[PDB]
Design a protein around this ligand. Structure first.
Ligand SMILES: COc1ncc(-c2cc3c(c(OCCN4CCC(C(C)(C)O)CC4)c2)COC3)cc1NS(C)(=O)=O
Length: 863
């Protein structure tokens, strides 16, 4: 009653779209999606509320383990018990498990409190002080990201013993409240008229129409007659296609482009020929067209919601039968596909097939041999499914039936293979369903790693209710960190009309599954709303007065009760494990670039030093490409660490949250190379030669024996970023967008341009950095060549995972980023990783690029 109405208003506010707008569409596909997904998500919520206390820790605080640990040394730890000011500091080993640490804390408590405690270490979990992060399970302490981080920074781990009854209290508080194949005639449509068309009156209007199965044409395109430009053009003509109705695949899309000719593009529109209930569409359709920025098959199959201004195309789908017609059921397809001749070939033809399947464009005879030998592909080359799918004639229903017969007994494939199958190049729904089935084995860590790409794939989906949406919702409702990022990736695109409906519906369903998480996300949205209002003030004030004046006025605005309340006590959108407790107004400011990004600092007495965290709020720029670049850098770091190579990278958080809005994580104790190289007087870093500035700064932050470790951190991170920027073609690199941590770690910021966007970005070696690597010496081949060895090792590891980067970037094409919109952009990655070459050929090639970059660096060393 009253609670259902309040929850509806809270979802509406959170997702940025009134739920009443869904009802107003009177769309059965929307209605069925809402009902089915609410039931699915409420079932997941019921399962969650009865989880055991350890399972509930797995849901809410999923373990953050080191990449080498997934699937010796002395350490001091500080441990306290919940709600007690008193703590215990003790020595443990990096190889010890949390249970031994907890048993030690319990024996310590029993001696102090003078009682032989009933509590066993099995009744507890260790919280990282003031963070939503826990250590539990049968893992050595150094396997935990928190401990491994402390061990490298030299800091003492601070942990809280939390009893099972306290974890159960958290679970309880967080509860939700109480026949086609007989139709041989050619497919045809009637193009009736156009409405609200805007073009040059001197020209003529033409409608180009094509039938597609993904990117592939099902037959040649057909064009209407040229008619004179006017607001309401009238064609009333039949467009006939070179394909029988019986041969239309299930996922066939009819694509239109309206243009003006003397070519002047105007608009485009697509639609699925079968509806969500597998019925062949008949009757009139008014297609509200999307403005053209000619045929766009990857474009959405839903009409433009701006019906007041959009050009409209009115078409007629003829009634092909006196009764409704549905795509044949799976049982009928398999029955037809069951029949076929097994391929019989010579020992040479078997060697010919093995060659092409293990090799990826083919010639016609190569395609025919693959299709002929399809049974052998299934039985002995199952990972070559994608090749067989690409040779299948999707315009012949018998060939499709034969392919589906094999797909239905195809063995599950590795994750890497399934990622390729999510591409728009594989539009069939059974293929889509097969790909998801092979992705069910993704660990939560892998899923989190590829979540951004899986969300982009939703933009290629033809219908609202789909296996990918159910999969993501199911995984999000079983892991709070996944749920957090799924919400933000969808929410940050609500201002995009082509996805607002789909994304709004998914976010509503998720909210049905966790009323409590909806409220936690609302608190984050309230802080972002205040940051946007504050940033607008800063933008205006910065153009009228001095920075100390704008900063004092920013502080006065933040000190208002409504701002102090909204900006405090939230989970960070960048990392829900990070708690943003007390906003430190005195330390807040803004940066001097065009959009005046805000620099917001927080503190938390419960987290101690670890509670000192910062966020950058930036409004005016699209942060999606920065996020993708940083996530690709983070992936390189994981892949290197899995081979035991830690290049001390800094993949700081970057999250779009709204229209040209997002957050960026602050890396404290860091400064830009430009600021350090200003070589200011009366500073500990001041130098005789500007080349000494960076090394002098590192020496001032790392006195005595600590200097050596800082130079090594610099060398390792420099190698990681040299390789990362070269592979990704990160350009426009200068002293203002390269930073250094006091630890010595170098890192890059502000990823404006990548994939050479178009010019081939060469490998870069900067003399100032070569100088630090060489410990300030002019000649130090021992250190310089160790650094070259790190670059080579890093590069060879990435090449081995070359296909993973290609498959992920291929899926990213769905995002519509201007620097990742075609094959040329992905060709850049193929060249940088030299994937066509042997490891020896690619290493020789990299060596030539590294040596070319050294000679270029030496043009500075000569000076
Ligand atoms: C996508 O856009 C960006 N991407 C990343 C960053 C970024 C990230 C990080 C850091 C940064 O520091 C910039 C140095 N410095 C910090 C302190 C500032 C003081 C408090 C004194 O005003 C003075 C500037 C900057 C540090 O940790 C991580 C900034 C931008 N946007 S921009 C270029 O318009 O600023």
């Amino acid at each position: 009653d009253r609670v259902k109405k309040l929850i509806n208003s809270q979802i509406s506010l959170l997702i940025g779209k009134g739920l009443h707008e869904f009802d107003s569409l009177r769309d059965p596909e929307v209605n069925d999606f809402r009902t089915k997904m609410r039931q699915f998500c409420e079932e997941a919520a019921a399962h969650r509320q009865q989880l055991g206390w350890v399972e509930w820790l797995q849901y809410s605080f999923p373990l953050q383990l080191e990449p080498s640990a997934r699937g010796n040394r002395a350490l001091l730890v500080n441990v306290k018990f919940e709600g007690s000011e008193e703590s215990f500091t003790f020595q443990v080993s990096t190889k010890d498990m949390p249970l031994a640490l907890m048993a030690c804390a319990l024996r310590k408590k029993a001696t102090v409190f003078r009682q032989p405690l009933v509590e066993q270490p099995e009744e507890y979990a260790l919280q990282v002080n003031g963070r939503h992060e826990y250590l539990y399970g049968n893992y050595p302490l150094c396997h935990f990201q928190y401990i491994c981080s402390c061990l490298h920074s030299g800091l003492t781990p601070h942990l809280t013993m939390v009893h099972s009854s306290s974890i159960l209290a958290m679970r309880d508080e967080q509860s939700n409240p109480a026949s086609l194949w007989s139709l041989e005639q050619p497919f045809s449509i009637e193009l009736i008229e156009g409405r609200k068309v805007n073009a040059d009156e001197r020209m003529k209007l033409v409608v180009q129409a094509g039938l597609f199965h993904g990117n592939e044409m099902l037959c040649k395109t057909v064009s209407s007659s040229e008619v004179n430009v006017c607001s309401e053009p009238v064609w009333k003509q039949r467009l006939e296609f070179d394909i029988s109705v019986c041969d239309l695949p299930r996922m066939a899309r009819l694509c239109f482009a309206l243009y003006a000719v003397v070519d002047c593009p105007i608009a485009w529109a697509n639609l699925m020929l079968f509806d969500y209930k597998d019925q062949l569409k008949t009757g009139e359709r008014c297609l509200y067209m999307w403005p053209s920025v000619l045929l766009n098959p990857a474009g959405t199959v839903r009409g433009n919601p701006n019906t007041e201004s959009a050009a409209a195309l009115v078409i007629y789908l003829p009634e092909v039968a006196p009764h409704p017609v549905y795509f044949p059921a799976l049982e009928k397809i398999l029955e037809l596909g069951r029949h076929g001749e097994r391929g019989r070939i010579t020992e040479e033809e078997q060697l010919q097939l093995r060659e092409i399947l293990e090799r990826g464009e083919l010639y016609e005879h190569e395609k025919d041999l693959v299709w002929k030998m399809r049974h052998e592909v299934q039985e002995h080359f199952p990972e070559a499914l994608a090749r067989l799918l690409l040779v299948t004639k999707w315009n012949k229903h018998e060939d499709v039936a034969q392919m589906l017969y094999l797909l239905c007994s195809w063995p599950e494939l590795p994750v890497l293979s399934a990622l390729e199958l999510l591409d728009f190049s594989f539009p069939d729904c059974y293929v889509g369903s097969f790909a998801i089935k092979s992705l069910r084995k993704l660990t939560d860590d892998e899923l989190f790693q590829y979540l951004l790409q899986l969300v982009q794939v939703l933009k290629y989906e033809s219908y609202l209710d789909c296996e990918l949406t159910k999969f993501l919702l199911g995984r999000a409702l079983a892991n709070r960190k996944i749920g957090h990022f799924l919400f933000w990736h969808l929410r940050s695109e609500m201002h995009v009309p082509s996805v607002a409906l789909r994304f709004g519906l998914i976010m509503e369903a998720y909210c049905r599954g966790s009323t409590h998480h909806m409220k936690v996300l609302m608190k984050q949205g309230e802080a972002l709303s205040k940051l946007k209002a504050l940033n607008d003030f800063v933008k205006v004030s910065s153009q009228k007065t001095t920075k100390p004046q704008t900063k004092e006025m920013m502080h006065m605005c933040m000190r208002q009760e409504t701002y102090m309340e909204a900006l405090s006590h939230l989970q960070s959108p960048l990392d829900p494990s990070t708690l943003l407790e007390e906003v430190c107004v005195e330390q807040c400011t803004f940066m001097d670039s065009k959009m005046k990004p805000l620099w917001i600092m927080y503190s938390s007495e419960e987290a101690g030093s670890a509670g000192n965290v910062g966020i950058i709020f930036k409004n005016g720029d699209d942060l999606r490409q920065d996020m993708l670049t940083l996530q690709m850098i983070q992936l390189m770091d994981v892949l290197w660490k899995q081979e035991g190579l830690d290049l001390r990278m800094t993949p700081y958080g970057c999250l779009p949250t709204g229209d040209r809005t997002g957050l960026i994580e602050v890396v404290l104790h860091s400064d830009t190379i430009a600021n350090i190289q200003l070589n200011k007087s009366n500073m500990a870093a001041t130098a005789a030669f500007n080349k000494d500035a960076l090394l002098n700064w590192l020496k001032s932050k790392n006195p005595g024996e600590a200097l050596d470790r800082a130079i090594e951190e610099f060398t390792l991170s420099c190698a990681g970023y040299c390789v990362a920027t070269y592979v990704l073609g990160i350009g426009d690199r200068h002293s203002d967008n390269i930073m250094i941590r006091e630890s010595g770690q170098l890192f890059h910021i502000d990823f404006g341009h990548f994939l050479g966007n178009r010019e081939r970005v060469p490998f870069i070696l900067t003399y100032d950095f070569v100088h630090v690597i060489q410990q300030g010496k002019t000649n130090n081949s021992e250190k310089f060549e160790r650094f070259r060895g790190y670059c080579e090792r890093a590069y060879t590891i990435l090449r081995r995972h070359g296909l993973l980067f290609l498959h992920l970037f291929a899926l990213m094409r769905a995002a519509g980023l201007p620097e990742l919109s075609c094959s040329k952009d992905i060709q850049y990655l193929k060249d940088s990783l030299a994937l066509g070459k042997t490891e020896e050929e690619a290493l020789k090639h990299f060596r030539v690029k590294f040596n070319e970059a050294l000679r270029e660096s030496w043009k500075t060393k000569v000076n």
